[PDB]
Write a protein that binds this ligand. Structure first.
Ligand code: BEF
Ligand code: MG
Lengths: 19, 128
C-alpha cells in the first residue's frame, strides 16, 4: 500500500492534494 | 489541439516509445520525435519547436524527474506540457513529480483511453 496499483488510485491521490 | 503539435517522447525502452508514438499518430499527431534519456531529450528540446513532452521516469544518464525540473527551470521551456508515463507508482514520488510541476501522471501499464484522457485534459487547462 506504499505503492499505487491503478490509474484511479493515482488520480485520487493527485486530486486529494490539489493537483 | 493543432494536429501539427510537436511531441517529444522520452523513454529508454524502444517498445514503449513505439506504443506512445503510434497512439499520437492514431490521435492525429504525426509530428513526433523521440529521446532515449533525459540528456538526449534536452539536447533535442534546444533546437526548439516542441509543444508537448511525454516522459518516462527511470532512464540512464538523466531520469524523468530531473528532466521535468530542468524544463520547468528553463525560461524558454518553463510552461511546456510534461506528461509523466511511467512504471513508478510509489506515492512519495508521484507527489514529488507533481510538486516539481508535472502536467499529469500516467502509470504503466496504461490503456490508450487513459493516455487520450490525460492529453485532452492538458489541452483544455492550457487552451491549446
Ligand atoms: F521506466 Be519508466 F519510469 F516506467
Ligand atoms: Mg525506464
Amino acid at each position: 500500500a506504499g505503492v499505487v496499483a491503478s490509474q484511479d488510485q493515482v488520480d485520487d491521490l493527485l486530486d486529494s492534494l490539489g493537483f | 489541439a493543432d494536429k501539427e503539435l510537436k511531441f517529444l517522447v522520452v523513454d529508454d525502452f524502444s517498445t514503449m516509445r513505439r506504443i506512445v508514438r503510434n497512439l499520437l499518430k492514431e490521435l492525429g499527431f504525426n509530428n513526433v520525435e523521440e529521446a532515449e534519456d533525459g540528456v538526449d531529450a534536452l539536447n533535442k528540446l534546444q533546437a526548439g519547436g516542441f509543444g508537448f513532452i511525454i516522459s518516462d521516469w527511470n532512464m540512464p544518464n538523466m531520469d524523468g524527474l530531473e528532466l521535468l525540473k530542468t524544463i520547468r527551470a528553463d525560461s524558454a521551456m518553463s510552461a511546456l506540457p510534461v506528461l509523466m508515463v511511467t512504471a513508478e507508482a510509489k506515492k512519495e514520488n508521484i507527489i514529488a513529480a507533481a510538486q516539481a510541476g508535472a502536467s499529469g501522471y500516467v502509470v504503466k501499464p496504461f490503456t490508450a483511453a487513459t493516455l487520450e484522457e490525460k492529453l485532452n485534459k492538458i489541452f483544455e487547462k492550457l487552451g491549446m
